[PDB]
Design a protein around this ligand. Sequence first.
Ligand code: ISC
Ligand code: MG
Length: 375
Amino acid sequence: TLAPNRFFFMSPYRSFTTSGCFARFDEPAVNGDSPDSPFQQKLAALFADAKAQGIKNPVMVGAIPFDPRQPSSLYIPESWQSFSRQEKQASARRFTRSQSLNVVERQAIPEQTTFEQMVARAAALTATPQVDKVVLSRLIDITTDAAIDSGVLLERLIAQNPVSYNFHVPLADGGVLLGASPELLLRKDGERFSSIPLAGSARRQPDEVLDREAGNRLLASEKDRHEHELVTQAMKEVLRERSSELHVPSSPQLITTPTLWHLATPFEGKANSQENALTLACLLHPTPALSGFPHQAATQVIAELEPFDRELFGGIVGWCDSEGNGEWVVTIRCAKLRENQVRLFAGAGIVPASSPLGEWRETGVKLSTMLNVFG
Ligand SMILES: C=C(O[C@H]1C=CC=C(C(=O)O)[C@@H]1O)C(=O)O
Ligand SMILES: [Mg+2]
């Protein structure tokens, strides 16, 4: 299985692994949408260093945190290795062995009543003109007795989530950021780009007809359509100023994960160039699916209600090459592991039609993707 110091990315676009490490890159990604920002200038330079030093076709991979004022977890590997997503999906339709793991401690940060009161405050605030949507999140901390094998976990992740954007990111503190993301934030392929934001959620059902009825009810739910509209209206505005052309559908489609129905709107467009995967990714992130709307207002509520720092959770994860192509997906349905400690994360968009218990339960089902991976 995959060694923990290797990047792994599984996607219908480009799926690959990396090896070794040429140079790390931790410049904060704030203002990274401007080609004249320190982030972009330093990026170009390192790609230049890489080629001079004889790195062929250098790639920048890893993760950027929710608040891009914080350092990035990005690097250029010594080498990378394509593989076929399809071959990997076929190989994962198997019984997936598991690491025997003992729990020494488990802890919900916060616990149910506290989270419910947080949702109620945020909901009440969204009832005022001051903000329209706040994304609130919570964690499950688990401590084992043994170092966790991130490679065995990845095999389970893939087997349980063969379709999503599956990532395994080595981290500078020795940890691994692992996950099964359903949300494309930015793909760039030549001059064209796309983004498939999600927001609005309904639990899958084992019964075929009930499953379909759950999806249908989601498309008819005013709360979830409102939650989703605030996201797409935001990104449409942002991308208007920046794209030669832009296609956005007028209503969402349905997408599934193993646990959830989601509302999804596909954006496609042509990039003004002098643009790359990261200039556009930093432009968009975070959307109101992960921060809220208006952005700065929502991030203030988040800072005042959440009893923890998100760090990489709710950021983006992916890759950019020196030609400006790349793909960035939202850092959700995911876990940070280091030695015998795991932190799982989930958020949910809060609007005036949000109930405290409903969003505790929605974040619960979101947490279940990684809880399933761990058993
Ligand atoms: C913040 C998360 O999801 C976002 C995107 C998909 C569904 C979401 C929702 O319905 O609240 C969130 O906007 C998460 O999965 O932890
Ligand atoms: Mg939601």
